[PDB]
């Protein structure tokens, strides 16, 4: 009952977040702030993949004859790299006194961003091998956690500055992603309830956060 229930809740919050996000795209910004729009567009692309998974889940859960948790990885392998890119864009936005856009960041940092996504890919591959019972759960937790910590280390040392704004965003995101590893430990029903709620936080709450930053910047523009 509780997987299907939390899946419907997720889908509700997905639809509300998509509405807020699309409105966000239209809100007037200074040219130096337009990377926030670039971020919201990528978050909406993520939402397309998330939605297809959640519709598949609610339809499929009617009649299930195996642990289908592994199917989430077909979503994660596409969405998590995009989410790491939008995190980099936000930190660069936050920490750049000068206007910066994704083209300039992508062109300059291509190699480093590739390695962030490669670390993240190895995390997911180890998780997938664990989820499909090809390696034991302890080895999965250790190997997956190693690559999670490597991904966030790479993010930290290149893209953070030493102030409260940076610590708050970085460490909240880190905790949320860590809890996907925590969830891995749990039996099928509890694990999938946890993933259903975590997706709301990692994906949808991030989009709403970006929307709020856009609202704040647009108001400054209106007032000036």
DSSP 100: -
* Phi-psi label, residue 29: left if phi above 0, alpha if psi -120 to 50, beta otherwise: beta
What resolution in angstrom units was achieved for this structure?
1.6
Q: Residue 146: helix, strand or coil by DSSP? A: helix
The C-alpha atoms of residue 94 and residue 6 are separated, in whole angstroms, by 33
**Elucidation method:** X-ray
3-state secondary structure 20-52: HHHHHCCCCCCHHHCHHHHHHHHHHHHHHHHHH
Domain residue ranges of the chain, discontinuous segments joined by +? 1-224
The CATH-assigned architecture of domain 1-224 is: Up-down Bundle (1.20)
Contact of 50 with 196, CB cutoff 8 Å: no
3-state secondary structure 163-205: CHHHHHHHHHHHHHHHHHHHHHCCCHHHHHHHHHHHHHHHHHH
The C-alpha atoms of residue 5 and residue 10 are separated, in whole angstroms, by 9
The C-alpha atoms of residue 120 and residue 77 are separated, in whole angstroms, by 9
The C-alpha atoms of residue 118 and residue 121 are separated, in whole angstroms, by 5
* Phi-psi label, residue 141: left if phi above 0, alpha if psi -120 to 50, beta otherwise: alpha
């Amino acid at each position: 009952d509780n997987i299907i229930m939390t899946a419907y809740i997720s889908i509700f919050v997905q639809i509300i977040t998509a509405i807020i996000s699309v409105y966000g795209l239209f809100i007037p910004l200074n040219f130096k702030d337009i990377i926030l729009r670039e971020i919201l567009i990528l978050e909406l692309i993520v939402q397309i993949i998330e939605f297809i998974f959640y519709i598949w889940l609610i339809i499929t859960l009617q009649s299930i004859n195996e642990d289908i948790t592994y199917v989430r990885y077909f979503d994660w392998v596409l969405t998590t790299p995009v989410m790491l890119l939008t995190t980099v864009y936000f930190f660069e936005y936050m920490n750049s006194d000068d206007g910066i856009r994704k083209k300039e960041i992508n062109d300059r940092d291509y190699v480093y961003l590739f390695y962030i996504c490669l670390s993240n890919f190895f995390m997911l591959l180890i998780g997938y091998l664990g989820e499909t019972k090809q390696i034991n759960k302890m080895l999965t937790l250790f190997g997956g956690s190693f690559f999670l910590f490597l991904t966030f280390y790479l993010l930290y040392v290149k893209y953070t500055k030493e102030n409260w704004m940076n610590y708050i965003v970085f460490y909240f995101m880190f905790l949320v992603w860590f809890l996907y590893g925590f969830a891995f430990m749990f039996p099928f029903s509890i694990k999938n309830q946890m993933y259903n709620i975590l997706d709301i936080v990692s994906k949808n709450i991030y989009s709403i956060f970006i929307f709020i930053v856009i609202l704040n910047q647009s108001y400054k523009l209106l007032l000036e």
